[model samples]
Target: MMRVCWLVRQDSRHQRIRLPHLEAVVIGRGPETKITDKKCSRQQVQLKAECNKGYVKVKQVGVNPTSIDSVVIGKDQEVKLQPGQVLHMVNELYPYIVEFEE
Candidate 1:
């Protein structure tokens, strides 16, 4: 069975649902896994996923993280859904989501 964790673009305000794809984990290894950045805290940041039409896919990383052609992970920020917020998932489909945590 297919279950969508995020909503679809047609139902959201931005017209796109931020879906989590990969989970980047800090190595925490000897010296190769240590970042001294204060704001660069090691946390489970759910990276959003996205895809593009033809054009050939390339590696995504570094400043701009631009590949020959890559996708930018979108974030699902907190938003005040209206009384009749539409849901466009597969299994977990609903219209007016009140207590749902997305």
Candidate 2:
């Protein structure tokens, strides 16, 4: 079976997100994260999964800053995210870990 990709919430209270192969999934303070902080955008990051390759492409589309391992992702910028990499939804808050599973 092909590996599945996911966004695993560090808080655990928030539900994890399943990544659809080659499709863009938006993440933010909305239903995806259940985050109520106004600092977070309703459409913060755009994630496109490459489950077969065990990685996902993360792009910041919101006004707020998103980070990977404390490195801030500028608005409209993108980066590759592998399994176990931590992604911060807004200004380093609401951390979600990337994962790949069979």
Candidate 3:
């Protein structure tokens, strides 16, 4: 099967995820998510988030998606991700320094 996305899972404990890429296996998941524009400040580049088992959140950073018509979610948001998409992520390059990767 030509799977585009991968759900990286751990072998023990919380069964944490490592990475999740379209048409590939997730290399780095959990709190080590990837992002773009590394130069952006935490308040600006710290908006990347995801949900677990329908739980909408990005690690310890919880946000209110409700009444947020100005933003996109799910498949609609996926559009932003494309081949050579200039948009990057947060914890992609320096996860150890950004957030709580250390």
Candidate 4:
């Protein structure tokens, strides 16, 4: 199966997620999410692969905004992300960081 893999990290805690044969994945604060942060929205963001392209598209789905690199993405906003890019939330407690990888 074709899979997309990435890492979510903050400080010493981290996790690896593999999206099998899929073009997109949901991010959230719940346990069901591959990426988790209590301060994040229940559905924080959705990352869809652009395949032949070098970047992926991200949709904001949370009440609180998310930061992609240096830009802030609020509800209904979207952005493209390249490899090694990081996604962050505004909260310090239960802070979040998701890193894209090859």
Candidate 5:
């Protein structure tokens, strides 16, 4: 079975994001995330799921910084999100957990 990646919101009020295999999706304060925070950009981050590898590649494509497990990443920088890791859309707001399922 192929693995699937999901962005599970920590707040639970927000809907989770399901990533398509090998396709990059933009995540931010607009329809994708429904986040009202002014600090969050409309295209805050780009996520690509590697279903076969069971991991997601997170790249910061916004003006503001994003973080993984509290470690901040600058614009154009990228990180690997394995299952159970935390992703902060912008700074520390709108946190989401990376989950993988088969």
Candidate 6:
């Protein structure tokens, strides 16, 4: 299982859901993540789990934060998600929370 912790509408919008068995987790205003907001793009970010070493691939497809976690990347580029790292989307209120189950 995976967890996405964040806020919206002045409420706690934390989500703990089962990760897709083999598909990548899509995030943003897209229906994939079931989240929509004025500050989000169609396909803002994507999380791909690489099982070999327990590392995940984080990709930002939006104009904002093409670079993440202090690394520079383009709209089509991707970076390795660091431990306890937070991926901020193009929003002033919402944030992407990535957590692994204990």
* lDDT value, residue 19 of candidate 5: 94
**Candidate 5 C-alpha error for residue 83, in Å:** 1.7
> Which pairs of residues have clashing backbones in candidate 1?
9-15, 9-16
Per-residue accuracy of model 6 over 18-65 as CA lDDT, tens digit each: 344235766677544455665567777666764434455767777665
Judged by whole-model lDDT over C-alpha atoms, candidate 6 comes out at: 0.53
Off by over 4 Å in 2: none
Off by over 4 Å in 1: 1-34, 53-102
Among all candidates shown, the one with the greatest TM-score: 2
Clash totals, every prediction: 2, 0, 11, 0, 0, 0
Model 6 weakest lDDT span, ten residues long: 3-12
Q: Candidate 2, residues 1-102: lDDT per residue as tens digits? A: 877887889779247788999999987877658889998988999999998888889999999889998899899999998766788888888888877777
- For model 4, how does the per-residue alpha-carbon lDDT over 23-100 read when each residue is reduced to its tens digit? 667767776544355568877878776544546577878777687665787787888766666667444333334443
- RMSD (Å) per prediction: 16.9, 1.4, 13.0, 3.9, 1.5, 5.0
Candidate 1 lDDT over residue span 1-102, tens digit each? 222233233433343333332322211112322323333223312222221211111121222211111223222221222323432111122121222132
lDDT of 3 at 53: 20
- TM-scores for candidates 1 onward, in order: 0.19, 0.92, 0.21, 0.65, 0.90, 0.59
**lDDT at residue 44 of model 1 (Cα atoms):** 12
lDDT for each residue of candidate 3 in 1-102, tens digit (9 for 90 to 100) = 222222221122233332232222222223334323334223322222222221112221212121122232221132222221222222222222111111
Q: Please state the error at residue 100 of candidate 1 in Å.
A: 32
Each model's C-alpha lDDT? 0.24, 0.86, 0.24, 0.60, 0.84, 0.53
**Judged by TM-score relative to the true structure, which candidate is superior, 2 or 3?**
2
Error of 6 at 18 (Å): 3.7
List runs of model 4 lying over 4 Å from the truth: 1-3, 10-14, 20-22, 32-38, 90-102
